[model samples]
Target: NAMLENIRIVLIETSHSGNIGSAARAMKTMGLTQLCLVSPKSVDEQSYALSAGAENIVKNARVVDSFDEAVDDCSLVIGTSARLRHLQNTLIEPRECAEKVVAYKGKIAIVFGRERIGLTNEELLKCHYHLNIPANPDYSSLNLAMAVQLVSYELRMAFLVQNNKKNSLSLEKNYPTTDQLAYFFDYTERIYQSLGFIQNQGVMRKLKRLYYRAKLEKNELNILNGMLSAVEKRIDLTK
Candidate 1:
């Protein structure tokens, strides 16, 4: 489903209120209204002023302390990366990224990192894919506002094309929310821990990568959960 409302533009630790305002404007222009601010600076006068006609977005923006809270409901999470480092191996341009985002039938989150350092490796780990803009190689770094604008533009374009193909046929589609996956991870981690299968971050990272890439539907998730519980039940018999 290419519903614009299902997508939320998330900014992580934005340092400047003005960039938040400008980013809000960019999103609104592209018909996206949902905005999540994670540990951002105060939305002062400059932010509202920069938002211009899109002040409502800034005013109504959901501000949260941690990244997880901002994206808890989002089934698909894409982090904006100016440069790719470790922990993030998949990089897709906005065009392709927008295509993937629009097809998702559940809540979608596109995270924009801070203006200066972009997203750290740990922050990057939380995302399924990193979106990279191929700007001028010599002057590659883009400001927060511009990043939001460009990405939002691609999303709007993709939505329009998708909308045109429709008028459109609607169907049932529901992917597992991020929290659902979190629950799965928590349970599986404990199972693996008890079995001595996981010793360090390596196994968990791979497990996370596998689940994230799988894009399991609710039914598949339930099956996985059941399998894990079955293992626990057998272990209970031994005890």
Candidate 2:
């Protein structure tokens, strides 16, 4: 129950209220309640009608102005995208992502992008990894609600595995949150600039991928940030 509670379903720039309602219904079937909407079209009668008895989810959904607000509290943010990008960031199948979500001990966010365009490049970058539902290659277009349903289904299955009390070691140490990683990235960029290594944005994005793959733990993050702080002080002394 706690692991499921940690998972949040985030919809960004959802254009159709009906899709939102249907997504809520999908989540309900999978025993998920937390729904966060970022700049979604106003929830209306159509959404209520489509929820089909899961209206409570629609009614209780949290609406926000931006993606950051929707996932600000989440430690892990997974973005769903149909295709892989040129510069990947730990891309994984939906099931694999669900397993990783269950293994963690903090807030987790599964973000589904807009109906037509899906998540933008910058939005996807906000996520540590991209989740791809392996649909037919020729026609891989999954509707917003359908995508949410698939991800929710995997999460439910993962919850079931955990509920069954399967022989597995629990994760004791807390991992770095998305917000913390963002701060570390900012600190890293400044250090890079100071070192005259801030050649372009690509370098930063690549470094992001490297660290995301490592999935840094709390102590590791602290050590890394501390070392960076020391280096920054050294640079200041030199100047």
Candidate 3:
């Protein structure tokens, strides 16, 4: 399992300075330092007040213009939810996701929505996986800060503490990360445009972001590359 240096905490359209403060605190306690804010409602010196003494996070947070840009460098991007959605997306328990994080040693990130209304279906779809903490069915909604606290705490215990003494199993495999996958897709997009599957590069850019965010495993990457090579060979034979 790989450690979580590759892991980042992304807050999407956060509406409160307090929530930003709290999320920063949660991330630090869990041994994570990277914090990305996308289209935040507010940010300032006062934001540190919410983190108590976890002011370091606020100091080093990366403020981005969009969620996609915030996590463009991540391999396995996950969206956090307190409830389920109608989308037929892959669903995993928080604990399970945590384990995968340990197993998949790459640049990863967890996406959190605004303090109100949660993530829209389109927003959730942007992620390869969705993580939710099992809670009372009748009262499933969790406060923004509380959700960050719970997930970040688990991640810290699992990755930071564990990595201090031993390397992550996933890291041992030395697999290609989602960032690398994006590079593959960049090539694919050129191929797709050549084959007329896509009209232009912009379409490829969006597709590649999610494509890379999938964080394909070694075997999976092999299969994909093989498929692409096969396709190219077939085209050459046709020519």
Instruction: List RMSD in Å for every model shown.
Output: 20.6, 20.5, 20.6
Give the per-residue lDDT of model 3 (tens digit) for 1-239: 33555788888888768888988887777777788888888987668898888998888888999777888878798998655666446878777788788778578888887655767777787888888878898878778778888887778666765566565554536577766676678667656766778875688768766756775677777788778777778777886
Taking all chains together, each candidate's TM-score versus the true structure is 0.67, 0.67, 0.63
> Which runs in model 2 stand beyond 4 Å of their true positions?
167-239
Which residue pairs overlap in candidate 2's backbone? none
Task: Show model 3 residue runs off by greater than 4 Å.
Answer: 160-239
- Better model by lDDT, 1 or 3? 1
lDDT values, one for every candidate: 0.88, 0.86, 0.77
Residue 123's lDDT in candidate 3: 75
lDDT of 2 at 94: 87
Give the candidate order by descending lDDT. Answer: 1, 2, 3
lDDT of 2: 0.86
Root-mean-square deviation of candidate 3: 20.6
What digit string (tens of lDDT, one per residue) describes model 1 on residues 1-239? Answer: 33888999999888878889999999999999999999887779999999999999998899999988989898799998865555346888999999999899789999998866887777788899899998898888889889999999999999998887786466437788899999999999998888888889888889899988988989999999999999999877887
The TM-score measured for candidate 3 stands at: 0.63
Please write out the lDDT profile of model 2 over residues 20-97, one tens digit for every residue: 889999999989989999988778998889999999988888999988898988988988876766636577998899
